[PDB]
Design a protein around this nucleic acid. Structure first.
Length: 427
DNA sequence: TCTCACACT
DNA sequence: AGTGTGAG
C-alpha cells in the first residue's frame, strides 16, 4: 500500500505580505505594530494585513481600524493606494512578481495567491542528493527549521527546543539511502532555507514555509511555526499531528464540507477519520470527496503542483454597501467605466509582460437584498483592450436586470460590480 | 460596509 | 455557460 511519500512539496507564505511591502518602502514602520487598511473614511478603514507586533495586541484582519486602535493605541497604519475611486493593489502585485521570479530559479512553482506559492522540490532534491555523495547534513544548513513532533522522549526556551528537535531528527537520519522519504524531505528543507535566504537577500522580505510530501501537509506545516520559520512535517509525524488537529484546519475543510464531516460523522479531529471505510466516506460526501478524505486523514494527497506562475484571470471589482448602492443608470455606467479602465491598464501590462491576450469578459453584479457573493454572472467577447467598449459591453449584458420601469434609475440597487478577463490565449 | 481557483451541473 | 464553494 502506497504511503504518499513520492514527492517533496513546499508551501511558502510571505509573512503579512502587504505590511512587509509598506515596511520596506517606509523604514519608520519596520518592527512596529502596523497594519494595512483600505478606505480610511469608514471607521478608519478595513484592515487587510497585520504585522506580528500588532497581532500580539489582538489586531486581526477584517477589523475596522478604529476598533484595532482600541486594542493597540500606537498601531501604525498604511493605506492601500486608491485609483479611479477604488483600491489599487498594483504595488503588492508587483512585489509578488519579484518574489515569484526568485523562487522559480530554485524549482517549479504554483502561484496560489498574491503572497503564497507551492513549490515542487522533487527534482531539485534528487540532483542535490547526487552532489552529496554521502555526506551528513549539518544542523548548520537548517538554521530556521522545525521538525514537527520533535523533540520527544527522555530546555525552557523556544530556540533550544527547535535545535534539540533538529538534532534528534538529524541524529537518526539514514543518509546512505538516497530514496528514504525522510532524507528527501530533509534535503528539501535545505533547499527551502536557501530559497528563503535568497528571497530575503534580494527583496528584503521574510517568509515562512512548510515542507512535506503534498500540498495539504505543506500548507498545514507552514502555519505551525510563524513568522520567518519553516517546518518539516514527515509522513511519520502525521498520526500524532492529526490526533488533535481540528478538521477545519485542513485545506478545503474550513467551510461547509468540513462542517458536514464533523456533524455527520460525529468527530472533531482529522485522525478520527481513519475509522471509516472509503465506501463509508464516499456515501456521505460523494465519490471524489470520500476518496480524498480517506487518503488525506492518512497523510496522503496527490494534487499536483501545477507549473503556473501567472494568474489565470485578471479581475476588478468593488462593493457598494448600504446607502452607497448604485441606484441610477448613469451611476452604474460610470463605475463600469472605472473598473474597465483599471482592467485595461492591467490587461495591456499583461500582454506586454507575458505574451498572452484575454478573450472573454465576465460581468458579475449583486443586487441589494440578495444573500450571496454574486447575484448574476454573464459573459461576452473581449475583442479589444479598450475601456469604453468593455464598459459598454458589460452594461449591455446586464442592462436587463434593471426591474425599474424608468430609464433613468436602477432598481434594485447594485451592491457589487465585477469585471474579469478570462480565457487567455498565446499572443 | 478585493480578489483568485475549482468542481458541479 | 452560470452557480456555489474555499481561500488569501
Amino acid at each position: 500500500m502506497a504511503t504518499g511519500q513520492d514527492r517533496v512539496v513546499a508551501l511558502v507564505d510571505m509573512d503579512c505580505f502587504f505590511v512587509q511591502v509598506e515596511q520596506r518602502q517606509n523604514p519608520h514602520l519596520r518592527n512596529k505594530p502596523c497594519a494595512v487598511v483600505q478606505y480610511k473614511s469608514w471607521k478608519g478603514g478595513g484592515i487587510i494585513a497585520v504585522s506580528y507586533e500588532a497581532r500580539a495586541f489582538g489586531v486581526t484582519r477584517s477589523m475596522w481600524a478604529d476598533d484595532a486602535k482600541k486594542l493597540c493605541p500606537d498601531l501604525l497604519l498604511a493605506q492601500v493606494r486608491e485609483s479611479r475611486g477604488k483600491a489599487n493593489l498594483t504595488k503588492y502585485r508587483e512585489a509578488s512578481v519579484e518574489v515569484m521570479e526568485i523562487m522559480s530559479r530554485f524549482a517549479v512553482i504554483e502561484r496560489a495567491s498574491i503572497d503564497e506559492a507551492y513549490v515542487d522540490l522533487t527534482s531539485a532534491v534528487q540532483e542535490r542528493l547526487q552532489k552529496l555523495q554521502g555526506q551528513p547534513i549539518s544542523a548548520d544548513l537548517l538554521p530556521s527549521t522545525y521538525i514537527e513532533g520533535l523533540p520527544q522522549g527522555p530546555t525552557v526556551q523556544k530556540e533550544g527546543m527547535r535545535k534539540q528537535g533538529l538534532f534528534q531528527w538529524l541524529d537518526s537520519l539514514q543518509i546512505d539511502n538516497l530514496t528514504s522519504p525522510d532524507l528527501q524531505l530533509t534535503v528539501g528543507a535545505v533547499i527551502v532555507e536557501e530559497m528563503r535566504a535568497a528571497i530575503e537577500r534580494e527583496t528584503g522580505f521574510q517568509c515562512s514555509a512548510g515542507i512535506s510530501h503534498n500540498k495539504v501537509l505543506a500548507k498545514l506545516a507552514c502555519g505551525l511555526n510563524k513568522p520567518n520559520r519553516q517546518t518539516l512535517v514527515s509522513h511519520g509525524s502525521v498520526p500524532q499531528l492529526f490526533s488533535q488537529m481540528p478538521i477545519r484546519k485542513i485545506r478545503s475543510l474550513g467551510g461547509k464540507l468540513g462542517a458536514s464531516v464533523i456533524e455527520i460523522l460525529g468527530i472533531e479531529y482529522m485522525g478520527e477519520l481513519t475509522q471509516f471505510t472509503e465506501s463509508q466516506l464516499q456515501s456521505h460526501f460523494g465519490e471524489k470527496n470520500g476518496s480524498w478524505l480517506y487518503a488525506m486523514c492518512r497523510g496522503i494527497e496527490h494534487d499536483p503542483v501545477k507549473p503556473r506562475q501567472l494568474p489565470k484571470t485578471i479581475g476588478c471589482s468593488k462593493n457598494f454597501p448600504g446607502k452607497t448602492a448604485l441606484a441610477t443608470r448613469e451611476q452604474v455606467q460610470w463605475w463600469l467605466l472605472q473598473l474597465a479602465q483599471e482592467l485595461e491598464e492591467r490587461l495591456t501590462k499583461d500582454r506586454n509582460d507575458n505574451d498572452r491576450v484575454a478573450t472573454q469578459l465576465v460581468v458579475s453584479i449583486r443586487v441589494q437584498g440578495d444573500k450571496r457573493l454574486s447575484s448574476l454572472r454573464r459573459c461576452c467577447a473581449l475583442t479589444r483592450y479598450d475601456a469604453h467598449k468593455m464598459s459598454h459591453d458589460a452594461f449591455t449584458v446586464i442592462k436587463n436586470c434593471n426591474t425599474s420601469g424608468i430609464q433613468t434609475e436602477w432598481s434594485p440597487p447594485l451592491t457589487m460590480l465585477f469585471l474579469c478577463a478570462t480565457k487567455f490565449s498565446a499572443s
